[PDB]
Each structure stands twice: as structure tokens, then as C-alpha cells.
Design a protein around this motif. Sequence first.
Motif, PDB file in Angstrom:
ATOM      1  N   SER A  52      37.394  47.936  30.928  1.00  0.00           N
ATOM      2  CA  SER A  52      38.851  48.236  31.014  1.00  0.00           C
ATOM      3  C   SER A  52      39.215  48.529  32.470  1.00  0.00           C
ATOM      4  CB  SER A  52      39.174  49.458  30.151  1.00  0.00           C
ATOM      5  OG  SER A  52      39.642  49.029  28.881  1.00  0.00           O
ATOM      6  N   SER A  53      38.886  49.699  32.945  1.00  0.00           N
ATOM      7  CA  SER A  53      39.200  50.049  34.360  1.00  0.00           C
ATOM      8  C   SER A  53      37.917  50.514  35.050  1.00  0.00           C
ATOM      9  CB  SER A  53      40.238  51.171  34.392  1.00  0.00           C
ATOM     10  OG  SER A  53      40.004  52.065  33.314  1.00  0.00           O
ATOM     11  N   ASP A  54      37.110  49.595  35.503  1.00  0.00           N
ATOM     12  CA  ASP A  54      35.837  49.983  36.174  1.00  0.00           C
ATOM     13  C   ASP A  54      35.424  48.901  37.165  1.00  0.00           C
ATOM     14  OD1 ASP A  54      35.334  48.311  33.779  1.00  0.00           O
ATOM     15  OD2 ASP A  54      33.329  48.363  34.570  1.00  0.00           O
ATOM     16  N   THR A  55      34.162  48.822  37.477  1.00  0.00           N
ATOM     17  CA  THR A  55      33.714  47.802  38.453  1.00  0.00           C
ATOM     18  C   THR A  55      33.592  46.442  37.764  1.00  0.00           C
ATOM     19  OG1 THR A  55      31.830  47.150  39.811  1.00  0.00           O
ATOM     20  CG2 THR A  55      31.393  48.523  37.880  1.00  0.00           C
ATOM     21  N   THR A  56      33.348  45.410  38.523  1.00  0.00           N
ATOM     22  CA  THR A  56      33.216  44.055  37.923  1.00  0.00           C
ATOM     23  C   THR A  56      32.225  43.231  38.762  1.00  0.00           C
ATOM     24  OG1 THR A  56      35.577  44.291  37.513  1.00  0.00           O
ATOM     25  CG2 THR A  56      34.554  42.187  36.942  1.00  0.00           C
TER      26      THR A  56
ATOM     27  N   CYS B 296      30.880  40.589  40.384  1.00  0.00           N
ATOM     28  CA  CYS B 296      31.349  39.205  40.670  1.00  0.00           C
ATOM     29  C   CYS B 296      30.787  38.738  42.001  1.00  0.00           C
ATOM     30  CB  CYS B 296      32.877  39.188  40.738  1.00  0.00           C
ATOM     31  SG  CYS B 296      33.557  38.585  39.174  1.00  0.00           S
ATOM     32  N   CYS B 297      31.122  37.548  42.393  1.00  0.00           N
ATOM     33  CA  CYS B 297      30.616  37.026  43.679  1.00  0.00           C
ATOM     34  C   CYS B 297      31.824  36.735  44.589  1.00  0.00           C
ATOM     35  CB  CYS B 297      29.742  35.777  43.395  1.00  0.00           C
ATOM     36  SG  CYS B 297      30.256  34.312  44.333  1.00  0.00           S
ATOM     37  N   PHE B 298      31.618  36.652  45.876  1.00  0.00           N
ATOM     38  CA  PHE B 298      32.759  36.366  46.791  1.00  0.00           C
ATOM     39  C   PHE B 298      32.614  34.953  47.355  1.00  0.00           C
ATOM     40  CE2 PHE B 298      34.972  36.049  50.778  1.00  0.00           C
ATOM     41  CZ  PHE B 298      36.222  36.623  50.451  1.00  0.00           C
ATOM     42  N   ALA B 299      31.662  34.748  48.223  1.00  0.00           N
ATOM     43  CA  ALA B 299      31.465  33.393  48.808  1.00  0.00           C
ATOM     44  C   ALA B 299      30.203  32.773  48.230  1.00  0.00           C
ATOM     45  CB  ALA B 299      31.340  33.500  50.329  1.00  0.00           C
TER      46      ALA B 299
ATOM     47  N   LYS C 180      36.271  36.690  35.562  1.00  0.00           N
ATOM     48  CA  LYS C 180      37.654  37.228  35.699  1.00  0.00           C
ATOM     49  C   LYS C 180      37.789  37.983  37.025  1.00  0.00           C
ATOM     50  CE  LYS C 180      38.162  41.108  33.502  1.00  0.00           C
ATOM     51  NZ  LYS C 180      37.611  42.490  33.406  1.00  0.00           N
ATOM     52  N   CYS C 181      37.680  37.294  38.129  1.00  0.00           N
ATOM     53  CA  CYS C 181      37.813  37.981  39.446  1.00  0.00           C
ATOM     54  C   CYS C 181      38.193  36.959  40.523  1.00  0.00           C
ATOM     55  CB  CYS C 181      36.494  38.663  39.812  1.00  0.00           C
ATOM     56  SG  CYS C 181      35.138  37.466  39.747  1.00  0.00           S
ATOM     57  N   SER C 182      38.842  35.895  40.135  1.00  0.00           N
ATOM     58  CA  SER C 182      39.259  34.863  41.127  1.00  0.00           C
ATOM     59  C   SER C 182      38.049  34.363  41.920  1.00  0.00           C
ATOM     60  CB  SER C 182      40.277  35.475  42.094  1.00  0.00           C
ATOM     61  OG  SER C 182      41.033  36.468  41.418  1.00  0.00           O
TER      62      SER C 182
ATOM     63  N   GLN D 111      21.926  39.680  44.542  1.00  0.00           N
ATOM     64  CA  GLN D 111      22.778  38.805  43.728  1.00  0.00           C
ATOM     65  C   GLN D 111      23.389  37.793  44.660  1.00  0.00           C
ATOM     66  OE1 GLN D 111      25.255  40.446  40.473  1.00  0.00           O
ATOM     67  NE2 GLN D 111      23.698  41.975  40.414  1.00  0.00           N
ATOM     68  N   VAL D 112      22.753  36.666  44.732  1.00  0.00           N
ATOM     69  CA  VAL D 112      23.185  35.587  45.648  1.00  0.00           C
ATOM     70  C   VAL D 112      24.068  34.598  44.901  1.00  0.00           C
ATOM     71  CG1 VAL D 112      22.190  34.444  47.621  1.00  0.00           C
ATOM     72  CG2 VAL D 112      20.686  35.745  46.114  1.00  0.00           C
ATOM     73  N   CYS D 113      25.265  34.382  45.363  1.00  0.00           N
ATOM     74  CA  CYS D 113      26.163  33.428  44.674  1.00  0.00           C
ATOM     75  C   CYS D 113      25.765  32.003  45.027  1.00  0.00           C
ATOM     76  CB  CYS D 113      27.587  33.652  45.160  1.00  0.00           C
ATOM     77  SG  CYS D 113      28.740  33.120  43.885  1.00  0.00           S
TER      78      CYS D 113
END
Lengths: 68, 68
Positions: free
Chosen positions: A4-8, A10-13, A33-35, A48-50
Motif C-alpha cells: 500500500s504505502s511502503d518501498t517498491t 524496482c530497477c532504474f537503468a 508498477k514503478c515506470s 540487484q542488477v537490472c
Amino acid sequence: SPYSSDTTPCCFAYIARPLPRAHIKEYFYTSGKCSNPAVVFVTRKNRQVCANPEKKWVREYINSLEMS
Amino acid sequence: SPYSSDTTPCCFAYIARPLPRAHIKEYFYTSGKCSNPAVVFVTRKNRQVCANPEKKWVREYINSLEMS
């Protein structure tokens, strides 16, 4: 774990290079769900390598990887 | 820790309620690059709980919190 309202996690690049499935250990697709959807190859160090979801070779390593 | 192609500790949705600084333990503003800037109050359980950067009361708890 209701998100709900916490961390997520995800990866950036995405890594600019097909991480050899040999040096990789696994992969964790973003929460979805993080663009920035993708697959995070958790390699030997397992940082955690994207690696980009549509980088072609990325899926070639996802299936080549065995869910340990 | 040069961030290039890996994970990115960020938040998705902000908690819909001013987390009482008493129940909170700290707060971690997102990395600052994931289309979701904010401050994630790490409360007693310390689950990374987001709280929105511009929710007013959020900053009232950030300063009220002491960097432990």
C-alpha cells in the motif's frame, strides 16, 4: 505482503551489456508498477542488477536460468 | 556505490495518514529518481513506509526525528 504505502523493489537503468547467464545467479522482474519494468539479474554478488525486459538476450537468460 | 544498472530503493504510494513520529523510527527519502519522490518512514517494524514528500505533516516528522 499487501503493498500500500511502503518501498517498491524496482530497477532504474538497465545494464548496457547482456550479462552472461554464467556470471548471473537469477533475475527478479520489478514489482510491475514503478515506470521501469525489467528483470534484475541477481548475479554472483547478487547486487540487484537490472537488464531491461525487452533487451532480447535478457529473456534468453531468464528462461536459461533455473528457479533455484 | 555507483548506481548504474541495478535496483533503486524507492516508494510507490504514500501512506494516507500522518504516521505519528512516535510510532515511526526514521524516514528514508527515495533515491531521488524513480517518478515517486517521498520520505519513507521506517517505523517500529521499520517496513519502508512511504509518506509523501509534500504531505506537510511529513516534513514535520522528518525534522522532529533525530538522525540516530
